[PDB]
Design a protein around this ligand. Sequence first.
Ligand SMILES: [Mg+2]
Ligand SMILES: [Mg+2]
Ligand SMILES: [Mg+2]
Ligand SMILES: [Mg+2]
Ligand SMILES: [Mg+2]
Ligand SMILES: [Mg+2]
Ligand SMILES: [Mg+2]
Ligand SMILES: [Mg+2]
Ligand SMILES: [Mg+2]
Ligand SMILES: [Mg+2]
Ligand SMILES: [Mg+2]
Ligand SMILES: [Mg+2]
Ligand SMILES: [Mg+2]
Ligand SMILES: [Mg+2]
Ligand SMILES: [Mg+2]
Ligand SMILES: [Mg+2]
Ligand SMILES: [Mg+2]
Ligand SMILES: [Mg+2]
Ligand SMILES: [Mg+2]
Ligand SMILES: [Mg+2]
Ligand SMILES: [Mg+2]
Ligand SMILES: [Mg+2]
Ligand SMILES: [Mg+2]
Ligand SMILES: [Mg+2]
Ligand SMILES: [Mg+2]
Ligand SMILES: [Mg+2]
Ligand SMILES: [Mg+2]
Ligand SMILES: [Mg+2]
Lengths: 129, 155, 81, 25, 144, 150, 91
Amino acid sequence: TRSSVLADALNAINNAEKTGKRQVLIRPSSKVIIKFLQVMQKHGYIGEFEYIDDHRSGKIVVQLNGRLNKCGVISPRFNVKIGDIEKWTANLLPARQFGYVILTTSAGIMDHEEARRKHVSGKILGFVY
Amino acid sequence: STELTVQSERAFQKQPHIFNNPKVKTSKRTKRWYKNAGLGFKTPKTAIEGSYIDKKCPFTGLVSIRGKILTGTVVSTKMHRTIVIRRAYLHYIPKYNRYEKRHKNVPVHVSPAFRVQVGDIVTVGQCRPISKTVRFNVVKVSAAAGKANKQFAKF
Amino acid sequence: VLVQDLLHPTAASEARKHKLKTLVQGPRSYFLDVKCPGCLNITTVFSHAQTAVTCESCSTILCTPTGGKAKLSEGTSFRRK
Amino acid sequence: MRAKWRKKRTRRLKRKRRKVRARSK
Amino acid sequence: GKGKPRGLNSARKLRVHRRNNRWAENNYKKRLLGTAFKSSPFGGSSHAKGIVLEKLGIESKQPNSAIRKCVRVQLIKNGKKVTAFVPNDGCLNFVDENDEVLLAGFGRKGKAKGDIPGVRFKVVKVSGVSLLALWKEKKEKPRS
Amino acid sequence: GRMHSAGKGISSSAIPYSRNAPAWFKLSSESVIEQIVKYARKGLTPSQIGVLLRDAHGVTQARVITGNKIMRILKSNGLAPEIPEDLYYLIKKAVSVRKHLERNRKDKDAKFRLILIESRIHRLARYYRTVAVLPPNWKYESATASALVN
Amino acid sequence: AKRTKKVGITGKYGVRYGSSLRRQVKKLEIQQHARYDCSFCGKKTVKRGAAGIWTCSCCKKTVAGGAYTVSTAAAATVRSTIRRLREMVEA
RNA sequence: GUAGGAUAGUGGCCUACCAUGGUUUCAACGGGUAACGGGGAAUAAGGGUUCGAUUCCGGAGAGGGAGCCUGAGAAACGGCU
RNA sequence: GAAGAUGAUCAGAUACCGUCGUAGUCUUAACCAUAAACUAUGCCGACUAGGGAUCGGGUGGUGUUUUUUUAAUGACCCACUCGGCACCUUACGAGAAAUCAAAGUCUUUGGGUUCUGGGGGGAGUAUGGUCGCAAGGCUGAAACUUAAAGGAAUUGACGGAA
Ligand SMILES: [Mg+2]
Ligand SMILES: [Mg+2]
Ligand SMILES: [Mg+2]
Ligand SMILES: [Mg+2]
Ligand SMILES: [Mg+2]
Ligand SMILES: [Mg+2]
Ligand SMILES: [Mg+2]
Ligand SMILES: [Mg+2]
Ligand SMILES: [Mg+2]
Ligand SMILES: [Mg+2]
Ligand SMILES: [Mg+2]
Ligand SMILES: [Mg+2]
Ligand SMILES: [Mg+2]
Ligand SMILES: [Mg+2]
Ligand SMILES: [Mg+2]
Ligand SMILES: [Mg+2]
Ligand SMILES: [Mg+2]
Ligand SMILES: [Mg+2]
Ligand SMILES: [Mg+2]
Ligand SMILES: [Mg+2]
Ligand SMILES: [Mg+2]
Ligand SMILES: [Mg+2]
Ligand SMILES: [Mg+2]
Ligand SMILES: [Mg+2]
Ligand SMILES: [Mg+2]
Ligand SMILES: [Mg+2]
Ligand SMILES: [Mg+2]
Ligand SMILES: [Mg+2]
């Protein structure tokens, strides 16, 4: 059954970005999906995304521009102390100069760089590069 | 607990060194000793006004609560003035970066100030060794509703 | 097509698609103001109406249930909604 | 050697082994 | 989902699954059954002294064609009979029947080496005076 | 998809976007409610009340037109049955299959389907006992069930 | 409790007579001692009364039957066959 | 559980009378250990794998068991029976 | 038609072939619990590519057939749609390849979960337990031995293959 709507959303985004589409459609559009997409959009990996409100769970149409290589989900959401964020970045990211590991942190869903600037850590969601 | 046969044993059940003087009739009937257990644990009015004895009670008995203050789900009220609680937790295996469900069964003395049943969340507090396996008293019972008011039959 | 408008798909496409697989899922069914040849009163009958619907005053079957839409029977007249 | 017939050979060896084991026991 | 469980609370299933599939290795199975002490004539040890019983000449395996010049050695610490290769040119002239040799293993942790069938040990010393040193010219073998 | 089958069918209702609806409705919410209560006095399951309201009358959704669901209206009017509707309709099927099986003892797939139906009953009854709709230690004993559902 | 694992009614025979023979007699001593339902009053009160006789304790009615069952399969086949031939003859 | 005894003292530690409990697939109980536990050690991308009788800490033992004397402290063995 | 009988042939004495024929094949009551039980491809879920054909259901044609002056229902045609057994083209991708719309979305490695494998033999053997009336089924080693066993494809050779 459907166990991770963020994994389904990010799989749809990867599969459309691989085949070169400029847009996806994502069902069923959680808050974690919206915040993850807002981080990706803030860092420039997607364009505008628009939330269709049907009265059940929502859909999202994301405008993929061209600049995404691999957005993914680290499932399970591992507990991540502040000392081993850098193991996760060294494992998941292609280089030290770009790419972001998205963390669910009690200061909000955020990437690892402004998890480090706020000196906060927590569960891992996934990555974008 | 003002009823159900306090003197049910071969010995006279009384609080030690508490004297009921028969020559001078006391203004309050059958003088009772109680205490606050400390740590914000309210002495129940059943403990204050009851007739039970329970020398291992944390409020009317001779034990003191000191040390760990644990919390657990009652799984067995099948003893006399002793319950078994389940302290379920999660153990972290650092190889797999994952946890495993574990549990520990803690036998706890329960006062007859408290009426407990299987399913109640109780707060227990460490005392001196009460028996071979019991080192804790129930100091608080944390199940008031328990979703057990709407199960009964209707018309 | 590699680039398309997913927020505003064409009405011909949305009328082709399944009722669950549109942009917002809604029903393709409808209701009918149905009158008998005999009685003057009006009955509101579902399109896919599952039931031998009669009037309150009539003794007459208005629709007969089928696999999909109910078959409006016996020369009765209908209007949508 | 077909594996089917080697299996049947070892199955007959099973019967002889348990026959002599029940003979001794 | 690539086989294995992934969830955060699924560490017992992963740990016991690794513990169960860990037995299919040669070394873990051998080390936890303790077969080096139950079997494998040198009881977990590197070397063992024994007493030569008879000089053997083992036919080498095909396609090689030679006589391998071993000895039958009864170990002091077990009483187990092994076959030990006397590992240079000559050197069977150096041993005897009925004297004390030190044996080592033969390179392959069991697993009889090369064209020698069923010989998995070798003679390092005879009478405590070291076959290589006897073979070069370096030492003289004691008469008793 | 189809917990006791291999079917993958999507055959559901697609209720509309309008949560207040449908602007040709000229009957009142209390008239809809007393029609619901009248149908339950006749003895109708909430599914049968809803289908009759939908087809004979114009009541598209009773949740939309009133403020309440049909089973909630029946509970407020004192007409809730002793076991829930889908569980009762599962126990009815199970006792019909068992009555069939006592004659046709050779019916191996009716035996199999009976196991499926009881498994479904026990899962549903377990849910109802945790959400406290059914009493605790309510058991489908499959010997008294024929009188449980008459 | 469960007094015996598998002998059942043939635990009275002890270790004697052979296991196959005691199984064969167990499957028929269950059959000849079972209470059967009456075809006349519906109560499960039919008992055997010197093989071939099956008497209901209510309503006192006695039916001829098999030696250990009320209706053997050959007799039920005969009943169906005679029903079929009678329906063919009188129609 | 109650009461006593005993102890330096809690306690089924033991006794007397009651109750029938207590642990377990979250692995109890049993079997093996060529197992003393730990600080630690070897190998080092990261994670790990293996070792730790051994200089520090804690335990246990003085050929095997048991019992005790003296003493603040021992069930001591370069003390006794 | 196992077994068994018999007739021929064959170097040895092709067991193939011919004629019989018990058990069996069928059925009732009880057992067994295995198959190359195969799609050698666990189950749930999402996405990624074009196509036509078909099965079941649904929807729409001022379509054909029942031409009877604006000709019910079935059958058929066309277009959609959901669900299914599959199929054709391509290789985005995957793979050691054969090939695969899944065996893809995997070193850019994490959707959920169960089971299994760890070089070839020894060996599905020994022993223990348990199930069975038995046959056997489930569970299931070790000593020892060994440098390959194997998978896919290429060239050749060979075929009582074309
Ligand atoms: Mg006590
Ligand atoms: Mg589905
Ligand atoms: Mg299921
Ligand atoms: Mg005392
Ligand atoms: Mg005491
Ligand atoms: Mg006692
Ligand atoms: Mg030791
Ligand atoms: Mg490495
Ligand atoms: Mg250690
Ligand atoms: Mg140490
Ligand atoms: Mg040692
Ligand atoms: Mg020390
Ligand atoms: Mg000592
Ligand atoms: Mg010594
Ligand atoms: Mg000693
Ligand atoms: Mg002194
Ligand atoms: Mg001593
Ligand atoms: Mg000394
Ligand atoms: Mg000393
Ligand atoms: Mg199999
Ligand atoms: Mg298979
Ligand atoms: Mg399954
Ligand atoms: Mg299709
Ligand atoms: Mg192997
Ligand atoms: Mg097996
Ligand atoms: Mg066996
Ligand atoms: Mg093969
Ligand atoms: Mg090959």
